[PDB]
Structures are given as structure tokens and as C-alpha cells.
Amino acid sequence: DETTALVCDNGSGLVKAGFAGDDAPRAVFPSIVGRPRHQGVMVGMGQKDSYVGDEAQSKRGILTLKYPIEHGIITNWDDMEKIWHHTFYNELRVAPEEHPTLLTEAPLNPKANREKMTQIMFETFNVPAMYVAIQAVLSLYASGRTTGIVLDSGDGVTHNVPIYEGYALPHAIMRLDLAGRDLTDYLMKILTERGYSFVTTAEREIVRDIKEKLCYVALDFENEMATAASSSSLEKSYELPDGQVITIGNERFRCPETLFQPSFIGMESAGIHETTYNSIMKCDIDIRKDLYANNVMSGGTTMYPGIADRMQKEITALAPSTMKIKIIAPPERKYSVWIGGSILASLSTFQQMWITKQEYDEAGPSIVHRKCF
Amino acid sequence: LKIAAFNIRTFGETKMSNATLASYIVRIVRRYDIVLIQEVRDSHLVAVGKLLDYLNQDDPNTYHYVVSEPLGRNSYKERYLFLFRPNKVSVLDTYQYDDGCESCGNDSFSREPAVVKFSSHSTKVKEFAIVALHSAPSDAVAEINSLYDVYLDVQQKWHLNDVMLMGDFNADCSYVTSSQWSSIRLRTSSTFQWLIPDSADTTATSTNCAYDRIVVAGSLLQSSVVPGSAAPFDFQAAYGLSNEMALAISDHYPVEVTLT
Amino acid sequence: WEQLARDRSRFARRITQAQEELSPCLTPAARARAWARL
Ligand SMILES: Nc1ncnc2c1ncn2[C@@H]1O[C@H](COP(=O)(O)OP(=O)(O)OP(=O)(O)O)[C@@H](O)[C@H]1O
Ligand SMILES: *[C@@H]1O[C@H](CO)[C@@H](O[C@@H]2O[C@H](CO)[C@@H](O)[C@H](O)[C@H]2NC(C)=O)[C@H](O)[C@H]1NC(C)=O
Ligand SMILES: [Ca+2]
Ligand SMILES: [Ca+2]
Ligand SMILES: [Ca+2]
């Protein structure tokens, strides 16, 4: 209420916010700031300069929208200040100056980004303490291990993050700029090619819903493309809110296949199965056995049914013949980063790892590199 | 000062994305220093935004807005959109009428009136309120009658007798018959002048119904009205349009009045 | 309030399981080892 530490997971698509000790975040809302394009009021209200999250999304027509987290990295601090102000005051209903605040960062977040993050928390929000955790590392902690390789796929970015004895191996971290909203856009494209139209805003936002509900990863893609026409079970129907009923067939598994075949959307990059292998082969040969046996999947874009079994297959094909391979896909893995942050911040050991106001006042923003790694 | 109340049938993204329909709607709005747009079917305010972009291309303060949340007892929901020229009038205060308990089944309006207090330095009346109502056709008698209580509410909150009540009241033909008018206090009370008469035609269709109305209470506001200025604006006649293109805009004409 | 009673203790057990597994990686000695690695 007035003492408990805060955990704020800042994502490209969604902000996950709550209290350390809780098993789930209190608040999950779009990482969006909207400013009125014109002067006016909502009936019975004074003039608003900004909306954040759900209200910014639902009123986007009269606003200019900003997505200040691009491919995991914060790129607009004015917008981000208003997302954080909304997180504390509107969503959690707390005073930031009363609560230690654990933030999350993308793997290989630039040092300047890290420092500005620490500066804002202390100078703009007056937090008594703060920490910055790599999102992939928290996910591994939440899975109940300190060694393994994490595949974190969200809305903006996918990462392979090998972790040993509790700490990331930065020289072996892979970044693929293919994730949730790329898959949504591809589905919108190929559903359009099937002979549908998503024109009105009401009809363009539902393509994400179809993706989250009806898409899956084929164990054998080539096989399921030939079986497509033949199959009695593939084709599914989705009802629009207006009444229209559209049919989705091979598009269900062609959409997330993009993860394994980035070429589908014109990227010359390698698939998430190849990046996972390449990440392990950049590590010491001494630990690879433990990495191969602890593939932990994280973020909303790993939620597709069958992705676990498909990873198992594609990595066994690439790895040494007799290597013991295990893919862990926690049912909670769309919030595993936040949940891992809740556990870390609840440990007695972590209480001396906080950057305190005193420490920041003596050392300045560069302290973050000394304390947060 | 020119004021209008315009029901634009299914005013949404489809109608505003249509460059022709947008042209005629914008031309109609541009006639008025204050205009109430009813039947705004705009989930994410995209149509309202695209209309304001069009209106404010050259000067960003040509029109300011007062817009409501989507109103309705069921899934079918409309907003009230006030567009005004801020160089002609100012908005001093706004509120949504408290029509009672929706969950109880006692709420008096399907679409609770939006209420705006205006500052008008250019007219005889300096301060006046506009109450917006698009009535449920099959509840027209009760809802128009309930506007009497909204007037008393405006009086209580702002100590203001100078109130304009306007919009698609559905105040003629099958929805309000001759005998039901004696049940409507807004008509039976001499406090209210009905500037749009029963004889007026406010339908773009071939029907003859005074559905859309402008009603004024208070000495100052009444004395500000230019005699004979209150009339429907037949946009089919004025823009030399076909009946088909006219209906594509709306099945209602605007009702306008001039103040001085 | 029975599904909640089970959920609270489940998470409490995860935190005590993390005190055992994770805290040895967060000891000033281990953080100095980890700090040297980079
Ligand atoms: N069941 C599901 N199947 C497929 N995709 C899903 C599912 N649930 C959520 N998603 C997608 O996951 C994404 C959100 O994941 P997440 O919250 O981990 O991302 P983020 O943290 O906002 O972004 P990033 O980590 O890339 O910065 C969205 O693209 C959403 O559509
Ligand atoms: C803009 O709006 C008009 C009117 O709604 C559209 O016109 C009609 O098109 C249909 C089919 O193309 C015809 O059956 C009608 O006879 C037309 N009606 C009128 C009144 O012209 C027009 O197509 C719209 N324009 C665009 C580009 O969408
Ligand atoms: Ca994330
Ligand atoms: Ca109501
Ligand atoms: Ca007519």
C-alpha cells in the first residue's frame, strides 16, 4: 500500500505493472500515449493534454498516438514519463516516492538509455530506491532455474539470451526484430489475399484477436500445406462484432511459421530455431549441455500452440545427435518477466542490491552499471 | 450567431472516408457557429477526428469540440458532438444529465442529454445553455416530457433560465400524435417557445414530419431569436442534389435558428 | 477465499525456493565473480 516494492515491465506492446510479492500484475495496458489533435473536451470534463493505455487506444480517432518503446528499447522519454506517471497514479494508485521500483530493460539496452531510466525515476518521480533487470533473466528466475537459454518473443522484438549461474552471457545474445505486430500484419496481408478486407478501425484490431485464438505452429509445415486442402479439421470460422463470419484455413499456421521462416515477410534474417542454436554455439562448449536442456520460452508470441514441440524438432535436427534437449513453455509465460521481477524483489538478499536515493545522489546515473548487471 | 441541430444517419468512418459525403457534411457544418451532430456511430472517435482535421486544415482553431462517450441502454450507442467556432462563442462548463439509475430500469433517457453553457458576447443573451436530445422513437413522448426536468436541473446547477433544447425529438407523425402533446410539459408550459413548428418538414425522405425541433426558454434568449430564422435547412434543394445523394448524406435536414 | 489461500502459499513457496536457488548467485562474492566475468 505505502511500503511494498513496485515491478514495472515496460514492453513494446504492453506495460505489465503491480506489487512485488503478488503472483500476477495488477495492471496490463498498451504502451501508448495519445495527445488531442484538436482543442475540445469530453462532456463533463476539463481539457486533457494526454491519455495513456486503454483510454488512449479507445479514443485514438481524435489523438496522435505514440509508441515510445520500439523493438524493446525506449526511444521517447517525454512519452515514457507519461506512461510511468499513468502506471503509478492512475493504474496502481500509489505515490512513487513511497515505493522502491524495479524496472525491466531489453537485453543489450544501451548505457545512455539505462542512465536516463535511473535519472527519471530519482529526479522526476523521487523513488526511494530503484533497480533495472534484463527481462529474459527474470523469466528464467520465474521458471525456477539460474542456468538456461531464454527465447523472449513479445510485440516488438525476439531475443535469445543464454544465462549461466544467474547472469546473461552478453557476447552470445541474439536479437531478431520479428515479433507480435509483424505476425499480426502478415496475417492481415494473407487473410486479405484470401479475399477479405480490414478497412474500418473496428475490423483492423480484430486480426490480433484471430491470431491469438486460431493460429498454431505446424510440427511439419511442408506436410500441413499439402494436407491443407485435404484436411476436415483445419478450416475454422471467426465471427466479427458486427455479424460477418470469415473463414481461416492454412493462414492459421502460415502466420507463426514466419518465426521459423522470416523470408515470408521479406527479412533475409535467420529463424528463431537457428538464432537459438547460434546463441548456444557462441557460448563456451563446457555449458552447452545445460543450455540445450533448459530452453525457457517467454513473452506473448511464444503462446502459439505447437511452438514447444516445433522447437524440440528443429533444434534436435541442428544439435549433436545424442544431446538431451528440453523446451520449457510455462503456461504463465506471457507474464513470466513480471512474475520473475516479483520474486527477485521479494528476496531478502536483493534488498542491498537496490540503487538507493543516497547512492544515486553521490554517484549519479552511471551507478546503474555498478549495481544493475 | 447561427445554431443548428443535425441528425447525420450512421455518421461513422465509412461516411467520413467518402470524399463526396465528407464535402457536403463539412459545407453544412461550416454554415454554423454552433452545430449539434447526433447519431455519431464512432467507436474510436475516428470519424469525429477526420471531420475536425477537414474543418481545421487552414486555422487549427476554426472549430473546437464538446463530444460525449457512446450513450445507450443496449449495444446500439451514439455520441452527442457539439462543434462551435471559439472566436464567436466560448464553452464555460459542460455536464451529462443524470437521468437516474440504469440498472434499476428507471433512467428517463436512452441517450442522456449533453448540456453546454455558452458565452456569446455578439448577441443580446450573453450566457445560455444548449441541451441535446436524440430521443428513442418509441419513447419520444416520455423523453421530450423528461426534458422539462432537465430544464429544472440546468436552472438548479447554473441559476440559468436562458436554455435552448434541440435535436431529433421524433416530435411528430407516429411517435408523437396530436393527443399525446398534452402529456408533454415542455409543450404545455408557456415557459417554452417552439421555434420549429409542427408544420415544418425536417425529413430528407418523402415523409412530412417535424421530427427535429429547437425549443427556447428565458426572456433574453427568446428576445435574441431573429423572427422567422428557425427553419429546416433543405440541403437537397440548396446544393441541387438528387434525392438519392441527399439520403446518402442523411434522412434528416438540420434545424437552424439565428440569434442577434 | 480457498483458491486464493492455495495461490498465496504456492507463490510463498516459489519465493522460499528462490531464496535457496537464486540468493547464492546474489552474494557479494558471487556478484564480484560475475562482475569480473564481463
Ligand atoms: N495466445 C497468443 N498467441 C499468439 N500471440 C499472442 C498470444 N497472446 C498474446 N500474443 C501476442 O504477444 C504480444 C505481446 O507479448 P508481450 O506482452 O510479451 O510483449 P511486449 O513485452 O509488449 O513486447 P516486447 O517484449 O517485444 O518489447 C502481442 O503481439 C500479442 O498479440
Ligand atoms: C460515396 O458515397 C456514395 C453514396 O453512398 C456512393 O455511391 C453509390 O454506389 C453504389 C455502388 O457503387 C451504387 O449502387 C449507388 O447507386 C451509388 N449511390 C449514389 C447516391 O451515388 C459512392 O460509391 C461512395 N464512393 C466511394 C468511393 O466509396
Ligand atoms: Ca517484453
Ligand atoms: Ca440512459
Ligand atoms: Ca420530407
Residue numbers in the entry:
A (entry chain A): 3 to 375
B (entry chain B): 1 to 260
C (entry chain C): 582 to 619
Provide the authors' own sentences about this structure as they appear in the paper.
Dephosphorylation of eIF2αP terminates signaling in the ISR.
We exploited the observation that G-actin can be recruited to the PPP1R15-containing holophosphatase in complex with DNase I25. Residues 582–619 of PPP1R15A form two helices separated by a sharp turn that wraps around G-actin, engaging the groove between subdomains I and III. Residues lining one face of the PPP1R15A helical extension form hydrophobic interactions and hydrogen bonds with G-actin. Human PPP1R15A Phe592 inserts into a hydrophobic cavity on the surface of actin, whereas Arg595 forms a salt bridge with actin Asp334 and PPP1R15A Arg612 forms hydrogen bonds with actin Tyr169 and Met355. These PPP1R15A residues are conserved across species and were selected for functional studies by mutagenesis. The strongest defect was observed in double mutants compromising both PPP1R15A Phe592 and Arg595; their catalytic efficiency (kcat/Km) was nearly 50-fold less than the wild type, approaching that of the apoenzyme (lacking G-actin). DNase I binds the opposite end of G-actin, whereas D-loop insertion in F-actin and G-actin binding by small molecules, such as cytochalasin D, overlaps the PPP1R15A site. These findings explain the ability of cytochalasin to antagonize the stimulatory effect of G-actin on eIF2αP dephosphorylation in vitro, and the inhibitory effect of drug-enforced actin polymerization on dephosphorylation in cells. The crystal structure of the binary PPP1R15A–G-actin (with the bound DNase I) also docks comfortably in the cryo-EM density, and the continuity of a composite PPP1R15B>A chain is readily established in the consecutively docked crystallographic structures.
